[PDB]
Ligand binder design. Structure first.
Ligand SMILES: CC(=O)N[C@@H]1[C@@H](O)[C@H](O[C@@H]2O[C@H](CO)[C@@H](O[C@@H]3O[C@H](CO)[C@@H](O[C@@H]4O[C@H](CO)[C@@H](O)[C@H](O)[C@H]4NC(C)=O)[C@H](O)[C@H]3NC(C)=O)[C@H](O)[C@H]2NC(C)=O)[C@@H](CO)O[C@H]1O
Ligand code: NI
Length: 268
């Protein structure tokens, strides 16, 4: 039930801090119990609201959030942007069919449709049902199974999606775009501070493909430097882009231009 999901949630209590407290705080708000802006610190305000929430619902009201309380939150919260508001595309594997979808996600998330259209194009040639034969990667945004979960747990409620054990929602174009936009926003906030410029589609794609931490180090690591030297992991994992045909290591500049090149093929 919602009980099994609440069952795997972290058992919280006053004093705790992190993503869980933040999710707790948000659900509280979305349930009518305001605890102010979600800051990730389980303090007094959150504690009181929890107790009161537990009392209003006949739950062991000691202030501790366990299976039953999580279950009650997933049941009473009201999504501020239910995903059904985002239309399904009238066809899979179709750029023209995904546009209206991306336009809706732009209005809902802020992220520009063109950027969304590019990503979907470079990741699944618009097949929102595709599953990479090489890894977890699935759907329009080729979400891995891991990051998808973390994405669904911190933003799902925002669009009315609590759990997705199978991670099967990645096959849903709507929720894929929504989560895609949220990931892009996360990443465009990590980058602008370091890149004295608005992160570009390629900057952003680099974070999407290699992760933000690495993209960060990379977008700031000396043009003529030997990438493989600074990104052994990625180089080993994607030698085709980090190594020349003869096996010599490419420079940072070359790798960048190759990537920008791959992105350049799915733009407007
Ligand atoms: C070998 C190969 O080519 N495989 C491809 C996959 O790698 C690729 O999937 C993407 O893979 C990267 C790295 O494996 C992965 O990166 C993770 O990204 C998340 C979020 O961007 C990072 O977590 C964030 O970290 C910051 C701090 O740096 C936090 O502030 C933020 O809150 C965190 N948010 C989340 C979501 O947790 C991870 O640190 C980072 N991990 C690593 C090791 O770098 C991407 O998430 C994967 N992208 C997707 C869409 O799944 C896949 C798709 O492009 O294609 C494969 O072929
Ligand atoms: Ni409980």
């Amino acid at each position: 039930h919602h009980h099994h999901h609440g069952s795997i949630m972290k058992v919280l209590r006053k004093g705790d801090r992190g993503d869980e407290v933040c999710q707790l705080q948000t659900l509280l708000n979305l349930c009518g119990y305001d605890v102010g802006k979600p800051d990730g610190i389980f303090g007094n305000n959150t504690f009181n609201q929890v107790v009161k929430f537990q009392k209003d619902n006949c739950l062991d009201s000691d202030g501790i959030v366990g299976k039953n309380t999580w279950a009650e939150l997933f049941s009473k919260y009201s999504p501020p942007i239910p995903y059904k508001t985002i239309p399904m595309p009238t066809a899979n594997k179709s750029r023209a069919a995904a546009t209206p979808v991306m336009n809706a996600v732009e209005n809902a998330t802020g992220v520009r449709s063109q950027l969304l259209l590019t990503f979907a194009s470079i990741e699944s040639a618009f097949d929102y049902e595709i599953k990479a034969k090489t890894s977890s990667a699935t759907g329009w945004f080729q979400f891995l199974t891991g990051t998808w979960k973390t994405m669904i747990e911190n933003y799902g409620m925002k669009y009315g999606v609590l759990t997705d054990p199978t991670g099967a929602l990645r096959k849903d174009p709507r929720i894929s775009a929504l989560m895609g936009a949220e990931l892009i926003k996360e990443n465009m906030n990590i980058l602008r501070p370091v890149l004295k410029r608005e992160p570009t589609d390629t900057d952003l794609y680099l974070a999407h493909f290699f992760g933000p931490g690495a993209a960060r180090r990379f977008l700031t690591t000396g043009q003529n430097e030997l990438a493989a030297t600074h990104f052994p992991k990625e180089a080993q994992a994607n030698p085709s882009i980090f190594y020349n045909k003869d096996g010599s290591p490419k420079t940072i500049q070359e790798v960048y231009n190759l990537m920008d090149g791959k992105v350049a093929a799915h733009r407007k």
